[PDB]
Amino acid sequence: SPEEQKERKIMKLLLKIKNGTPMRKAALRQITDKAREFGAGPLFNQILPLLMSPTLEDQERHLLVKVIDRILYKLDDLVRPYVHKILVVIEPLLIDEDYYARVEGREIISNLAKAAGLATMISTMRPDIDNMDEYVRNTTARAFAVVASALGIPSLLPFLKAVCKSKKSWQARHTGIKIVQQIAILMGCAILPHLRSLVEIIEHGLVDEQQKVRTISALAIAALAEAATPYGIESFDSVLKPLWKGIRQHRGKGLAAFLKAIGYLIPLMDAEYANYYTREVMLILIREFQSPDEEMKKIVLKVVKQCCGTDGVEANYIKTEILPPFFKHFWQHRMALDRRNYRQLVDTTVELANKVGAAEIISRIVDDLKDEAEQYRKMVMETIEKIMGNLGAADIDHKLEEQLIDGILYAFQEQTTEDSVMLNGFGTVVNALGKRVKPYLPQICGTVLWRLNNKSAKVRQQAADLISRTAVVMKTCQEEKLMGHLGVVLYEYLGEEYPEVLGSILGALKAIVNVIGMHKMTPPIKDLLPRLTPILKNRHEKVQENCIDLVGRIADRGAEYVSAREWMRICFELLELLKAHKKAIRRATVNTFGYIAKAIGPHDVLATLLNNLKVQERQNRVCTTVAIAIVAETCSPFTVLPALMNEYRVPELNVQNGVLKSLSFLFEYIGEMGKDYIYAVTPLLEDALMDRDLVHRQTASAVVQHMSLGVYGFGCEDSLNHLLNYVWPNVFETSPHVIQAVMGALEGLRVAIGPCRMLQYCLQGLFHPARKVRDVYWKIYNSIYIGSQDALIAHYPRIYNDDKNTYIRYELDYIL
Amino acid sequence: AAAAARAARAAAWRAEQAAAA
Amino acid sequence: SKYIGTGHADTTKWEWLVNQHRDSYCSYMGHFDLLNYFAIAENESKARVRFNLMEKMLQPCGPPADK
Amino acid sequence: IFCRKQAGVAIGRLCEKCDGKCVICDSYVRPCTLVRICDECNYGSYQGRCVICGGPGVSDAYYCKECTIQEKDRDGCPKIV
RNA sequence: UAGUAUCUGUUCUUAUCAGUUUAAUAUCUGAU
RNA sequence: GAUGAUGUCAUACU
Ligand SMILES: *C[C@]1(O)C[C@@](C)(OC)O[C@H](/C=C/C(C)=C/C[C@@H]2O[C@H](C)[C@H](NC(=O)/C=C\[C@H](C)OC(C)=O)C[C@@H]2C)[C@H]1O
Ligand SMILES: [Zn+2]
Ligand SMILES: [Zn+2]
Ligand SMILES: [Zn+2]
């Protein structure tokens, strides 16, 4: 049949779309163009089971949604007889947990709305306005909100005006107000031009006889206010008197919705009305403070967070009226056993301290730092952490300081679990106190040492982490003897078998060396570093990073007490770690190798590296190459280039390729520092660019590229022009890695010498008789043009007119 | 060999780094 | 290849110079001081100069040649 | 092999295997400018994935200093297809 | 593992035009 | 003084 043929062709096309490579583009283009010929019938009849297939993958869903979009755009009024069925098929997608599923549902529905028009959408969706099932009404409300987003809010405004005032049933009014709420939630700040109209349309519902209509009206007001933040308060004038009166009558979840609406309305107001209104609602709020139902308590907590964050509500009012019942009724051990209440109360209390002052809030809870309930201790400690991280410790006096010290000491001592919150809290409080924790530092380090001697290694790891976090303040407090004792105990704990704790211990040792110094360190460096030498072959990345950083700092500021042979051994062990996958270990390795190279002479380590360069001919040769570059960047390059170039005179070729690769990476790595060494390496590059071996030409072109990009804008134009004369003749080379390196060199030279010189090299062969020459030169011209389109205007040659066309750019020939 | 003069080379490098700074 | 103004081994002189002239005209309309110079040379407003260059963008080198 | 669509507000990512590498020229020297990718390459289940392998992303992708000098950061979405 | 390079071997009537192609040869296709 | 092209060679480097 022709319908069966249509079905088979559509099936083949969809198959080419889902599984094809291109093919997808062509098939997509043809199914939109042939949409009206196929008809909405077979198309949607086959698409809907595929769209709701349980085994479809996400990107396949995106592809099919794009197909739907294209076929919908050309098929406008032909989709109308099937809109209702499309709706019944699609609306479970609008409540799916996947966010992208809901976005694709809204996009499909909006495309459907714009293809079929507002009329058929209202005519289609009206019989379900008063349906008994709540979820069908919820789906229709979301669908109407997306339809409003598609066609514009004013287009759907009269329908809402009619539905929200329907005399026949409260269900229609409920659905219309829910439509308004979903419009707010979906469109955000875009609802602002019609916010007044929506509020005027729904405001009557607040005094309705049905409770659910009042609740959905308050929730819609809250959604409109949240979407309008921080604008549009004037548009709410007409809603102010109902809600404010409603909370003096309603109780329960209705009162909760009304207060939530009020709490979202207050931050939109100016100072005077915010003050007046929050004074008007604080009595009802404080009354609801002791409610047993948890959703009400969460909503009122959110509302107090909102209203205390509004300009106009003075700090003294919050001090005298809000703070005592809040702290008396909310800070109890029952609420700490649920995560949401925990987090919400913490953020609310931090915002309160943000407005009324840090000390005012901190002094009311420090003693609870010594409660036996460990979860309560964790909650109060987290609260103090966030408050003190925002504002500091400048507001805290001596008495509250001692209270804080005693509380954190007790909380840290009576610890049975490896809480990272206790570690971060201790660290940030001590580091925020600064030089003020000086009198309390003996007992504190005693407790750290206590936890450093705990039987379980995770507690030890936490103690070492605390040491690292607090070493700087302990230094500025001048207590170097306890720090030295801590270094001695950690050095005695360096044979620890568990890698993460050992890494934390090494980090603590790095902190202790950074604060005490290398001369007064206990144990001596001459005993410390050989103990660190076998730890470098450990496989865990944390131990590796920490130990490498420690060795690097030792080599940076205390290499006096260590012989050169031990440092060469460290360098030999360190060379292999330059090819690690983790960038932190590579960075630490670079830093540490640089510190060692700076500390010791260049000659011996450079000799070892050149020996390695010649005797490897394998993958770690590039490792050796990186090490040479590190030496050149950290130490001075005039200590490397003489010996490197004298080793180049050996005629074994493979060593020369190694020298060239080393120079390439060296110049790329040192960048701007190479500007004083172009002349020094110019003869070797002259030799290599004219050598018979083509690998030499490719690597030398790489050196030229890295050089030209590194010295860009520092006046090396003549040396690069000279090297350009040796780089250029290789543009006809056939080997891909070679011509690729040549083009890279040409691009670097375009940057460094300028597009005008490169264009001057280009113009003869752009219209050369040979097609191969034209291919090469037009490739180069394309690269120059893409990189330097606007500059070439000044560099094009004078092309004279002929008998047919004008080729002179006369404007540039103007002379005032 | 080089191992006997390694300490002398390190001392010369330290002297050069002190004189350069 | 998809960038307008680039070329290849079969690029004709007319197309190349048409690309050059269009690039140059757009550059004049971008670089304020070039257009300033051109508006000082003739006695025309900057808007008139912009209009003239835009009318020149259609066929800056005249009609093309055959083959 | 490059997507080369018009990049948007999405930030390109790199996996733990290629952390710190330049997506254009494969160099590990001197990252410079943050990588932006097209919206299609970051849509849906693709968000936060490595711009080279499509695996989990753990760090922000960067163009090296040499690529930004040569304006190779202005050529479009560098997600490898 | 399968890619490149270097030696060895071969490398096509000292008989004439046209066509494809080539920068030009070369190659290929027809006639004498 | 114009050294190219090919494979059954054979030999080296990735
Ligand atoms: C995306 C990937 O291509 C995926 C994969 C599997 O590709 C094969 O793995 C790639 C990772 C390759 C690595 C880590 C290679 C090691 C290299 O080591 C040499 C010696 C180079 N090292 C440096 O440049 C080292 C330090 C530099 C100076 O400093 C910094 C901070 O990098 C480069 C490679 C790291 C992966 O990319
Ligand atoms: Zn992309
Ligand atoms: Zn990856
Ligand atoms: Zn790069």
DSSP states along A365-377: TGGGGG-S-HHHH
CA nearest ligand 1 atom 9, residue? D17
Domain ranges of chain C: 1-67
> How far apart, in whole angstroms, are the C-alpha atoms of residue A550 and residue A378?
33
CA A502 to chain centre: 30
| Mutation to probe ligand 1, out of D14, D15, D18, D23 (largest number of atoms < 8 A from CB) | D18
Helix (DSSP H) and strand (DSSP E) numbers for chain A:
42, 0
**Which among A61, A581, A751 is the nearest to D70, CB-wise?**
A751
**Kind and range of the H or E element at A79?**
none
- What contacts 24+ positions apart, CB below 8 Å, involve A11-14? A11/A46, A14/A46, A14/A47, A14/A50, A14/A64, A14/A67
Residue A809 lies in a domain: no
Cis, peptide link before residue A230, omega less than 30° from 0: yes
Cis, peptide link before residue A523, omega less than 30° from 0: yes
Q: Which residues contact A649 (CB under 8 A, 6 or more apart)?
A: none
> How far apart, in whole angstroms, are the C-alpha atoms of residue A678 and residue A669?
15
Which residue(s) pair with D10 in the sheet?
A: D37
> How far apart, in whole angstroms, are the C-alpha atoms of residue A561 and residue A520?
12
> How far apart, in whole angstroms, are the C-alpha atoms of residue D49 and residue D54?
5
CB A388 within 8 A of CB A350: no
Q: Which residues contact A553 (CB under 8 A, 6 or more apart)?
A: A510, A513, A514, A595
Residue A246 lies in a domain: yes
Running DSSP on this structure, what letter comes out for residue D62?
A: E
What are the structure tokens assigned to A741, written together? 């390196």
Owning domain of residue A104: 1-797
Query: Which DSSP string do the residues of A541-565 spell out, in sequence order?
Result: HHHHHHHHHHHHHHHHH-GGGS-HH
Buried b (16+ CB within 10 A) or exposed e, A758-783: bbebbeebbeeeeeebbebbbbbbbb
CA of A691 and C1' of F9: distance in angstroms?
29
Residue in the structure block whose two tokens are 């409260």: A170
Residue A739 to residues A30, A625, D24, Cα–Cα distance (Å): 41, 23, 18
What are the structure tokens assigned to D56, written together? 């989990």
In angstroms, this model's resolution equals: 3.1
Going by their DSSP bridges, the two strands D31-34 and D62-64 should be labelled as antiparallel
Which technique was the structure solved with, according to the deposited record? cryo-EM
Residue numbers after which chain A is interrupted (C to N above 2.5 A) read 21
Residue in the structure block whose two tokens are 């960075």: A587
Residue A539 lies in a domain: yes
CB A775 within 8 A of CB A743: no
Give the count of beta carbons closer than 10 Å to the beta carbon of residue A633. Answer: 18
> How far apart, in whole angstroms, are the C-alpha atoms of residue C56 and residue A225?
54
What are the structure tokens assigned to A422, written together? 């206790």
Residue A805 lies in a domain: no
Residue A286 lies in a domain: yes
Buried b (16+ CB within 10 A) or exposed e, A516-542: bebeebbeebeebbeebeebbeeeeeb
> How far apart, in whole angstroms, are the C-alpha atoms of residue A561 and residue A588?
22
> How far apart, in whole angstroms, are the C-alpha atoms of residue A758 and residue A197?
65
> How far apart, in whole angstroms, are the C-alpha atoms of residue A750 and residue A770?
25
Domain count within chain A: 1
Residue A346 to residues A351, A387, A400, A711, A738, Cα–Cα distance (Å): 9, 9, 20, 54, 63
> How far apart, in whole angstroms, are the C-alpha atoms of residue A39 and residue A7?
11
Q: What is the dihedral of CA B5, B9, B15, B21, to 10 degrees?
A: -170
Buried b (16+ CB within 10 A) or exposed e, A434-457: eebbeebbeebbebbeebbeeeeb
Q: What are phi and psi of D39, to 5 degrees?
A: -75, -35
**Kind and range of the H or E element at D31?**
strand D31-34
Residue numbers after which chain B is interrupted (C to N above 2.5 A) read none
* Nearest residue to A218 (alpha-carbon basis) of A130, A303, A312: A303
> How far apart, in whole angstroms, are the C-alpha atoms of residue A266 and residue A243?
12
Residues of chain A contacting B3 with CB distance shorter than 8 Å: 565
> How far apart, in whole angstroms, are the C-alpha atoms of residue B9 and residue A294?
76
Residue D9, chain A, CB below 8 Å: the answer is no
> How far apart, in whole angstroms, are the C-alpha atoms of residue A124 and residue A752?
68
Q: What are phi and psi of A640, to 5 degrees?
A: -120, -45
Q: What are phi and psi of B4, to 5 degrees?
A: -70, -35
> How far apart, in whole angstroms, are the C-alpha atoms of residue A260 and residue A226?
10
Running DSSP on this structure, what letter comes out for residue A312?
A: T
Question: Is residue D44 classed exposed, middle or buried when 0-12, 13-18 and 19+ CB atoms within 10 A define those classes?
Answer: middle
> How far apart, in whole angstroms, are the C-alpha atoms of residue A464 and residue A472?
14
Which residue(s) pair with D13 in the sheet?
A: D50, D60
Q: How far is A60 from chain C (nearest CA, A)?
A: 29
Residue type, A444: I
How far does the centroid of ligand 3 lie from the alpha carbon of residue D50, in Å? 5
Give the count of beta carbons closer than 10 Å to the beta carbon of residue A251. Answer: 10
Ligand 1: residues within 6 Å at CB?
A 578-579, 581, 583, 586-587, 590, 622-623, 626; D 17-18, 20-21, 28-29, 52-53
> How far apart, in whole angstroms, are the C-alpha atoms of residue D30 and residue A668?
9
Residue A813 lies in a domain: no
- What contacts 24+ positions apart, CB below 8 Å, involve A715-720? A715/A675, A716/A675, A716/A678, A716/A752, A717/A752, A717/A753, A717/A754, A719/A678, A719/A679, A719/A682, A720/A678, A720/A749, A720/A752, A720/A753
> How far apart, in whole angstroms, are the C-alpha atoms of residue A509 and residue A552?
12
> How far apart, in whole angstroms, are the C-alpha atoms of residue A493 and residue A502?
8
Q: What are phi and psi of D36, to 5 degrees?
A: -110, 145
> How far apart, in whole angstroms, are the C-alpha atoms of residue D79 and residue A380?
46
List, chain by chain, residues whose CB lies under 7 Å from nucleic acid strand F.
Answer: A 617, 654
Q: How far is B15 from chain A (nearest CA, A)?
A: 10
> How far apart, in whole angstroms, are the C-alpha atoms of residue C18 and residue C30?
18
> How far apart, in whole angstroms, are the C-alpha atoms of residue B8 and residue A117?
91
Q: What are phi and psi of D60, to 5 degrees?
A: -75, 135
Query: Is the C-alpha dihedral spanning B5, B7, B9, B15 positive or negative?
Result: negative
Q: What are phi and psi of A469, to 5 degrees?
A: -70, -30
> How far apart, in whole angstroms, are the C-alpha atoms of residue B16 and residue A500?
41
